[PDB]
Symmetry: D3
Subunit: 166 residues, 6 copies
Amino acid sequence: EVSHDADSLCVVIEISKHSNIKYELDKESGALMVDRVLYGAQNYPANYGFVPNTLGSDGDPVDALVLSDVAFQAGSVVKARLVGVLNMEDESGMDEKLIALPIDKIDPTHSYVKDIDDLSKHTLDKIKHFFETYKDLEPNKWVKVKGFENKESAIKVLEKAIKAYQ
Amino acid sequence: EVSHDADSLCVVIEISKHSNIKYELDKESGALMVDRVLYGAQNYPANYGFVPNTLGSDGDPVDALVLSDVAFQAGSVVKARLVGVLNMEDESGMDEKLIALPIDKIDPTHSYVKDIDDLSKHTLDKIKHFFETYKDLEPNKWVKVKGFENKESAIKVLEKAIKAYQ
Amino acid sequence: EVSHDADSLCVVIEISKHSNIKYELDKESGALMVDRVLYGAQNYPANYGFVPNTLGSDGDPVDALVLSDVAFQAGSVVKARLVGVLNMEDESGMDEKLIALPIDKIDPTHSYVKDIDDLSKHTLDKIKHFFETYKDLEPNKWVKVKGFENKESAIKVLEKAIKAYQ
Amino acid sequence: EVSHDADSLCVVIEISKHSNIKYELDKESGALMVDRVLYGAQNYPANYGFVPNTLGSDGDPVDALVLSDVAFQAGSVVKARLVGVLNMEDESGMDEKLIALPIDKIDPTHSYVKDIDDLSKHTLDKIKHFFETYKDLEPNKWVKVKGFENKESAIKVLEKAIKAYQ
Amino acid sequence: EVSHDADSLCVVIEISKHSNIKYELDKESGALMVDRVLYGAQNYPANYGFVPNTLGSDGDPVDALVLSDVAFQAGSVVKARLVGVLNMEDESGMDEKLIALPIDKIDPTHSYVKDIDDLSKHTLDKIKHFFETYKDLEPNKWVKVKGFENKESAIKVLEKAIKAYQ
Amino acid sequence: EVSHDADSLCVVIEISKHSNIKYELDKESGALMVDRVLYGAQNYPANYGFVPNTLGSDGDPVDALVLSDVAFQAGSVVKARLVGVLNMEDESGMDEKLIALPIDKIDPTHSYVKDIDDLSKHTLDKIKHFFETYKDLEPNKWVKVKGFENKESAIKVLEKAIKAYQ
């Protein structure tokens, strides 16, 4: 039962916070595939996944970062709420990463975060710097981060991705 | 192949020992859902899960704690054996938590534990205190632990849950 | 070179965040003594230590919690800044726990926290609940938490402890 | 989509590197079963799994060790490449363990390893010693390791296992 | 203040439970030296250290294993109580390893263990097997474990070591 | 007893491999000070420390990276052997980082590495990229990595640092 509610959307976790291993769920066998081990001495600054039944810019489900103090197991599903979006350009084109938090029912730790600007400057910079450099060592690949936009913008991105899938 | 044998019953793990993240398996997609992150500075004193094809007091499969020195991955299934049951009352009514150990074929570490009284006083108190306080910070929720009962009592609870499902 | 500056005071770490092992530094050999392993399924919600050359209510150096996203090694020393104080009563009398953060030069993650009220409600409740229950299982011991006071109050506590030592 | 290419074969991970818990995937429910907790103070020297749609010496899919600096989650699937095979005899008969590495696209860390002899003497000895002793404490079970053979030999083992399944 | 009381003797921890890194304290600088990284895929089955101001069979302070569910930091000191001794022969001669537990004041988890026979068969076998094989891969070194003796025997070993130092 | 032998020099560890916390030993109290928590989502690619009784380019003891598969505890001392040196320029001037491995007596895992060129291209690139970016987020600070030089060059750096201290 995939929920597309901006304040309670399902996010399938593929990368656990702090891990340097990117997994990728196969949409036909449900197999969690080992996709990449970071080339650099880095670790994902947040849990990372995708929103089912959506179609993002690159033809794959729209991506979402789920910020939390804890790391969720790759393969699990967490109900989250949008607070913003991170825009970036890579060798394939534009890419968007929804910025979310688990719903308060799951973990109210950051219930005070209502919009992108409520997140600390330090956290935003860390996330931006990660995407800006995590593919440095990968040949023929690169990422140029543009910046973050608020929840209103993120909702537009989500709805556009939902409509595209339909 | 779900086994309901008291000395070798299947337990689907939803919470790994030492974790502060409670997962919950969805019975229709097999999706491991992130259900709750403990509000307090606590961690589950044992692996936690449910017995398939059973119907407990609250309408959900009967719960079981699988005591072990190691933490089993959420989503895995372990064959266990009963040694007792923990009775408690929450805001919804009575609740029972079967107390089990992996079968000796899997891990014989605590093969000497034949009944609830074989478990140390310290371990029992730690488990009781966990359930007695882990929901303190959650509004409108609470737990009043009654105490532990032996294997004979646990078997009755299991059989009643098995019959109810049938 | 022990600094007693409220915005840059030295804190000797004795307990690492997330650990259930309390160490205690011996002031004569510099030996890090294993003092206690929590009886319950809990873990320290922050790094914990004391301020050298001070004399608190119980005759020992004044205690300080150093809030951080990371865990500092027991035995290390971190320069911190005060943001508040936690008052509680135990079986021995009143006790105070200074609430601090590493100085921005060390980690600016929570540089936005200027006073106790800047900390999230969730974090404060978790800390309070920890002290309120972590000694439940210890016989003849108990803790009744009163509440938190601001940085202005914490500074008074520190200065009083510094003067007492002198 | 199971790939049987020697330089890109699918390996279903059942044991994560450094873990002392052996899981076993059930081929009918996809359930990850807890199979064994090592009796000794040991840990798997590599990620461990099997190659789907193959039939090894003991009637089960052929086993493969996936050497890596990182530990892959039990239940995930990694595309690997063969570099050798480890031959051993146990109480049931001969057994073979394919020796592999993730494909360079996933992690190029050990891209320099082209054949068994490229692996360090220390790593080979550690792996051999693990299988030679990890079942010492298990009654009625034992392992006598013969030695390692090169990639050419491993390919023969794989093809024979693939044909047997067909 | 080194205590030589059999029921409360000081043990300086040099190896943390589960670690594969053996440290060794230098008695002149207090420097914790990295001494050895296990050659095999193994990990210490208990915390390991020595009793200050004693002289064991090999001319060094008498060794002690401190059994616990938790791992103590290398370099820390824990007050323990004897429950037995493990006798073994290596390439240098006879060696004895005192078997201890933290005093109940520190952690009462295993307060029920009064003598060697109170420890589980599984734990004893795991410890014995560790010493029997952890030096297999080290050239010119080996260990032949004899067996465990009770607390009465351990006390004799300790007193003899204390007298020798004096 | 500080050894300055190129093939067995003492290295005081201040940063443990994989950690994002940089400690710094105080040369007057032996206090392990918390110096910095990385601003980015990164982790040290190796154990890091300094060689006692030496004087490097910046007036502090010469730095050394100790490559290993395991992480050594901050504050410990490991005997290492040189295999190269990493040259870089920061906002303060030129800086050199000796590249070393534990001596074979401690851990022979990488005994095959005799000179810088024996290290994998992947490991060298990861280390270089770490220093090139780990200070990106720190204001008024930066690092421009030049490249690695062999053991012969590293020895010159060490001897020059030893003479300078004398």
